[PDB]
Design brief:
Layout: E1 2-7, H1 15-27, E2 32-35, H2 54-65, E3 68-72, H3 82-91, E4 110-116, H4 124-132, E5 136-137, E6 142-144, H5 150-153, H6 160-176
Parallel strand pairs: 1-2, 1-3, 3-4, 4-5, 4-6
Length: 179
Amino acid sequence: KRILFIVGSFSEGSFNRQLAKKAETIIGDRAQVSYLSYDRVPFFNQDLETSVHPEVAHAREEVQEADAIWIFSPVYNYAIPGPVKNLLDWLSRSLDLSDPTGPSVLQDKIVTVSSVANGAEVFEDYRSLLPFIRMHLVDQLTGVPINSEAWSTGILKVSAEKLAELSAQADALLSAIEN
């Protein structure tokens, strides 16, 4: 198996990247995890679609080679992080320039999401968008809050109950890929 991890943060100590490391570990060898680098991607715009952008061609293959995708992203003002939406705006484009209404690399891709923040409304955005751009959303999303100690140690601590959700979520994702 192959699972691509996408972190909605570019910082090295992100609480969501830390959650992503724990997820990568709870699956261990059941699947080959890898992280997507998209630090630099052109601002999307239609007039540029006839042009080749390396960073975009890159992400496209990574998603094409992957069996599934797991997004660990923070929420900014209740929404999907800008850089993530912009990435999806490119990945959701038709693979054929002859056929604007054709399928993108996201067609039927199994995907699921986890986030580390404090909100009621956390995954509403993703639940509506990911399925709309033709992906298959494993709707077992784990939302993890931030322990008040992490604010000074910079280290995220997850309860055992939440850690259970995350492992079950990793299991639901492995089964979907199985079926």
